[PDB]
Amino acid sequence: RFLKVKNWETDVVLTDTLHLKSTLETGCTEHICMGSIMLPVRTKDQLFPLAKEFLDQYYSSIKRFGSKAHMDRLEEVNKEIESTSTYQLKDTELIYGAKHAWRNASRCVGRIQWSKLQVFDARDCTTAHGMFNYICNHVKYATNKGNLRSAITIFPQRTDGKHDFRVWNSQLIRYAGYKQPDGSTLGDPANVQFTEICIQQGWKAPRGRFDVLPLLLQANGNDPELFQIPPELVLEVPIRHPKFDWFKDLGLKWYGLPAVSNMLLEIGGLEFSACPFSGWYMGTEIGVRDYCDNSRYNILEEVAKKMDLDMRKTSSLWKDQALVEINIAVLYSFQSDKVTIVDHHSATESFIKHMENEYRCRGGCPADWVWIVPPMSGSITPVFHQEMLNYRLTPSFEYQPDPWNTHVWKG
Amino acid sequence: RFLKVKNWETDVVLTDTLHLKSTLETGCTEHICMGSIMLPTKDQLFPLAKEFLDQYYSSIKRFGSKAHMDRLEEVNKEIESTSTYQLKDTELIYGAKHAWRNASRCVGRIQWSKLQVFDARDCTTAHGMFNYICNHVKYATNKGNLRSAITIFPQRTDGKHDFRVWNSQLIRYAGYKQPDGSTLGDPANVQFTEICIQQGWKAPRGRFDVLPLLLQANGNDPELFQIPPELVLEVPIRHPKFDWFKDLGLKWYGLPAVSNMLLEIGGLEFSACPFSGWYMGTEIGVRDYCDNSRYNILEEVAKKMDLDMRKTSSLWKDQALVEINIAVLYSFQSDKVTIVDHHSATESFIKHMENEYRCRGGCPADWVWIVPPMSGSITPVFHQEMLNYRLTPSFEYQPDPWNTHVW
Numbered sequence: 001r002f003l004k005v006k007n008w009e010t011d012v013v014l015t016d017t018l019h020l021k022s023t024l025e026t027g028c029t030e031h032i033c034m035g036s037i038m039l040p041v042r043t044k045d046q047l048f049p050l051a052k053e054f055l056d057q058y059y060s061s062i063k064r065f066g067s068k069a070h071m072d073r074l075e076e077v078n079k080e081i082e083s084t085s086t087y088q089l090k091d092t093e094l095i096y097g098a099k100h101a102w103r104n105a106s107r108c109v110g111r112i113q114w115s116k117l118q119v120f121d122a123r124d125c126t127t128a129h130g131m132f133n134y135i136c137n138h139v140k141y142a143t144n145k146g147n148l149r150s151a152i153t154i155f156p157q158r159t160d161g162k163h164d165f166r167v168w169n170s171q172l173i174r175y176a177g178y179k180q181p182d183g184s185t186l187g188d189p190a191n192v193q194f195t196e197i198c199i200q201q202g203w204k205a206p207r208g209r210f211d212v213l214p215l216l217l218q219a220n221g222n223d224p225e226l227f228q229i230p231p232e233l234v235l236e237v238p239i240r241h242p243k244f245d246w247f248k249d250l251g252l253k254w255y256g257l258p259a260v261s262n263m264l265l266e267i268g269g270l271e272f273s274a275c276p277f278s279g280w281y282m283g284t285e286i287g288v289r290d291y292c293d294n295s296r297y298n299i300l301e302e303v304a305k306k307m308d309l310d311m312r313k314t315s316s317l318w319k320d321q322a323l324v325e326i327n328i329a330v331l332y333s334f335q336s337d338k339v340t341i342v343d344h345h346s347a348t349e350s351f352i353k354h355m356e357n358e359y360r361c362r363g364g365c366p367a368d369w370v371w372i373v374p375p376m377s378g379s380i381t382p383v384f385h386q387e388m389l390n391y392r393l394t395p396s397f398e399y400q401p402d403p404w405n406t407h408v409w410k411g
Numbered sequence: 412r413f414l415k416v417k418n419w420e421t422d423v424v425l426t427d428t429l430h431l432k433s434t435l436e437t438g439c440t441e442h443i444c445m446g447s448i449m450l451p452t453k454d455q456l457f458p459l460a461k462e463f464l465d466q467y468y469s470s471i472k473r474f475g476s477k478a479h480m481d482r483l484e485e486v487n488k489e490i491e492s493t494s495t496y497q498l499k500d501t502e503l504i505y506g507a508k509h510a511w512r513n514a515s516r517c518v519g520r521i522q523w524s525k526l527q528v529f530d531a532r533d534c535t536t537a538h539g540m541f542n543y544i545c546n547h548v549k550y551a552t553n554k555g556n557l558r559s560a561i562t563i564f565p566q567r568t569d570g571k572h573d574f575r576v577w578n579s580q581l582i583r584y585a586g587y588k589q590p591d592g593s594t595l596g597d598p599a600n601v602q603f604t605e606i607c608i609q610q611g612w613k614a615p616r617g618r619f620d621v622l623p624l625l626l627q628a629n630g631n632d633p634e635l636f637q638i639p640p641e642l643v644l645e646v647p648i649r650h651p652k653f654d655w656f657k658d659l660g661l662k663w664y665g666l667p668a669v670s671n672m673l674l675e676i677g678g679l680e681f682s683a684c685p686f687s688g689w690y691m692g693t694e695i696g697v698r699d700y701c702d703n704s705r706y707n708i709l710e711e712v713a714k715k716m717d718l719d720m721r722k723t724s725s726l727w728k729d730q731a732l733v734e735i736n737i738a739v740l741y742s743f744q745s746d747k748v749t750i751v752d753h754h755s756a757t758e759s760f761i762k763h764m765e766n767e768y769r770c771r772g773g774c775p776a777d778w779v780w781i782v783p784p785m786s787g788s789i790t791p792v793f794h795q796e797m798l799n800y801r802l803t804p805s806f807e808y809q810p811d812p813w814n815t816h817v818w
């Protein structure tokens with residue numbers, strides 16, 4: 001079966017065959033679409049076909065499918081599975097796997113870069129202190145004094161589900177959030193609960209508006225341990241505006257390295273519960289979501305007051321005006337400090353080209369329109385006009401429950 | 412099978428049971444989501460009639476009544492007898508209002524119960540259709556105080572006697588292909604503007620020429636009609652800061668009136684059922700004006716604002732986009748023509764959703780369409796999970812007449 005997607009602005013039509021290789025369920029049925037829903041211990045039984053499927057993919061990609069090297073590897077994995085109930089990926093397989101999970105991440109607009117991913121193999125790590133060392137090295141490598149480099153660090157895979165490695169932070173670098181007794185919030189409201197855990201675990205909080213959270217690291221199913229990232233490793237950018245000089249006095253800054261640290265990486269049936277990865281920011285992540293979400297820093301009003309906009313009626317579009325100037329500020333500040341960033345116009349244009357290339361070379365490109373379209377100025381980006389098909393391929397990045405909800409405390 | 416939707420900004424969780432009633436398919440499967448795809452007999456008829464009458468009679472606290480049973484009986488006999496049936500006026504109105512209520516792509520549904528339904532099932536000719544459409548336009552326009560309306564023409568019989576309005580909207584601007592290679596007016600309507608000429612229209616080849624109506628009654632060839640200019644409320648677009656904005660020479664019409672959809676009620680098919688509401692500002696300023704394949708004025712505006720169009724990262728497009736949408740809202744409000752901004756409209760829709768979940772067990776909504784085409788995440792609907800499914804009565808797309816018309 002073939003499926004066509006149309007770009008309604010260019011009339012370019014593409015044909016998808018790749019969705020046939022999809023196994024995992026979407027959440028949708030023939031009777032209901034769940035496209036806007038945010039989120040709609042493994043036996044040797046199911047493990048070998050998952051291994052085989054992956055190794056089939058891997059050997060095809062290296063033009064060695066059906067080779068003696070291919071067949072020997074399958075054999076070796078099978079024997080290892082029934083003997084040990086799991087298996088170990090070769091370094092080459094791991095790298096392929098990590099790159100392809102990124103390639104398959106339908107919610108990521110940055111995928112044109114998928115083949116350039118630095119993979120750090122941390123499967124020999126055994127303790128939290130060891131994890132901290134690997135993470136520091138990742139941050140330094142990825143940061144690269146502002147010339148950001150995509151990277152992922154992969155810790156040992158799940159075994160029985162009782163010895164999981166987990167980074168308890170949602171991102172490696174994030175600002176603390178503090179609930180005040182008067183009901184207000186200081187810092188990042190998104191991080192209030194995690195901030196409380198850190199404090200409870202013995203973090204001495206500065207209690208400011210932009211306090212970099214400590215790392216909370218779990219190795220081998222043990223209780224997590226606190227580590228402060230060396231401040232010299234945390235690149236931050238003061239936010240100013242090219243035209244408005246009062247903008248700097250808002251006191252805004254942001255960190256340069258966006259690094260997701262709470263997802264699960266699945267490769268060939270193996271589950272890597274700690275696999276922090278990092279790229280670089282698309283400007284709207286900070287300027288629209290981090291700063292302007294009502295549930296985050298929520299600075300729209302203060303900005304709009306300082307711009308002296310008509311704030312009595314929404315039909316003045318003061319919010320839209322303030323939102324644009326903030327995003328201009330974010331982009332300006334990063335570029336001026338020579339920290340890698342991409343605007344949503346550039347990002348989405350590149351994604352369209354990536355997607356077209358993927359359709360031709362790969363037979364498809366799974367994409368989640370709801371997440372790909374930027375949270376401002378949607379229809380003046382080419383992705384808005386692009387039909388997209390969403391389906392799940394493996395290797396993949398998946399959500400997993402927050403570890404504080406599942407952790408068995410040792411004491 | 413009982414589904415919850417979360418708002419992520421408010422943590423409000425709603426439980427949906429209404430989707431269970433859905434009958435038609437979405438295009439999605441367990442293995443693939445098609446949420447962003449724009450378009451994914453006697454024995455067929457009676458269960459459809461039955462489903463509709465059941466909900467109609469349920470809605471008036473008379474489910475399981477003799478009148479219910481009698482009506483079901485009467486319709487059943489009429490179908491067995493005539494291979495179709497006729498809706499009572501009360502059912503027709505109920506059906507029209509509920510088709511709007513069920514329109515998962517319409518953000519304006521909080522108004523759904525206040526629809527004026529014009530019954531034009533007695534219409535037999537294109538001149539008759541023209542008259543009904545003028546009356547609709549005059550009524551809906553209401554000198555600028557817009558009122559929601561639908562006019563319903565006779566239902567499909569054998570597919571040879573279809574009533575069709577050929578225009579996609581009652582009121583639209585012509586589009587002409589220059590020899591210069593470019594496009595004069597609205598590029599979306601080049602193909603239709605040609606068919607007007609092929610059938611006899613005399614285009615004044617301008618930029619904002621109100622298109623004539625092409626009306627098809629009872630399967631006949633369509634005829635041309637000029638809507639009385641006095642009935643077409645238009646708004647000159649000016650900005651409340653930039654006095655150069657007027658010289659762009661932009662204007663738009665006040666009445667948004669979809670005329671090419673199919674209304675399906677109780678299995679019956681109404682191929683001609685133009686309806687109108689009033690504009691949300693972004694439909695005009697973002698889509699009509701700034702789409703590349705439409706009037707595409709972003710560059711010209713940016714020039715006049717003297718922005719740095721050297722780099723995309725100056726966000727000159729975004730900046731201009733906002734100003735254009737300010738002008739649109741300003742111009743309509745200044746001329747006292749009903750318009751709603753995307754903030755007000757989406758705020759209204761969240762309230763509607765909560766009402767629907769409370770009083771109906773759910774609200775089908777297409778997030779891809781409900782989230783406005785600018786400033787997505789600063790409107791409440793962006794953070795609102797939505798379930799999309801098809802309920803009937805419904806408005807459906809249908810093929811363009813000029814591909815199907817047996818001339």
Ligand code: HEM
Nearest residue numbers: 102105107108109110113150152277278279280281282397
């Ligand atoms: C290199 C530049 C990159 C850019 C510009 C970029 C851009 C983005 C953006 C804008 C999102 C949406 C985030 C949100 O709204 O929550 C996203 C999500 C995502 N990205 Fe990237 N990304 C990049 C690198 C990477 C890398 C290196 C990986 C993995 C190796 C990756 C994997 C993912 C995944 C799995 C998601 C979905 C997260 C979720 O569902 O919560 N991306 N990306």
Ligand code: HEM
Nearest residue numbers: 511514516517518519522559560686687688689690691806
């Ligand atoms: C009264 C104020 C109304 C507002 C503010 C409103 C708003 C909107 C908007 C913004 C859209 C998206 C249009 C697009 O992007 O192409 C839409 C679509 C739609 N509306 Fe409304 N509307 C209103 C009235 C109505 C009425 C009176 C009806 C029917 C009786 C209706 C039925 C529909 C349908 C079926 C669609 C989907 C169009 C499509 O799929 O192409 N709406 N509405």
Ligand SMILES: Fc1cccc(C[C@@H]2C[C@H]2NCCc2ccnc(-n3ccnc3)n2)c1
Nearest residue numbers: 038039108171258259260277278279280399
């Ligand atoms: F399914 C969900 C339920 C609740 C919240 C949510 C928000 C998603 C976590 C946010 N997605 C990651 C955001 C992020 C932060 C930093 N860097 C990056 N990043 C880096 C490379 N690619 C993305 N993404 C989803």
Ligand SMILES: Fc1cccc(C[C@@H]2C[C@H]2NCCc2ccnc(-n3ccnc3)n2)c1
Nearest residue numbers: 449450517519580667668669686687688689
């Ligand atoms: F599937 C598609 C293929 C090509 C174009 C497309 C756009 C849909 C026509 C636009 N939907 C109606 C737009 C419109 C215009 C005027 N008024 C209203 N309107 C009035 C009340 N509610 C909506 N909608 C879809």
Ligand SMILES: C[C@H](O)[C@H](O)[C@H]1CNc2nc(N)[nH]c(=O)c2N1
Nearest residue numbers: 036037038370371793794795796
């Ligand atoms: C309900 C809705 O799915 C949710 O708000 C989504 C919308 N699209 C998004 N798109 C991106 N990139 N990131 C997000 O967090 C979201 N949130």
Ligand SMILES: C[C@H](O)[C@H](O)[C@H]1CNc2nc(N)[nH]c(=O)c2N1
Nearest residue numbers: 384385386387447448449779780
């Ligand atoms: C490809 C995508 O489905 C298409 O561009 C949609 C996106 N969302 C939309 N939303 C609305 N309201 N109207 C539209 O025409 C569209 N177009």
Ligand SMILES: [Zn+2]
Nearest residue numbers: 028033439444
């Ligand atoms: Zn779907």
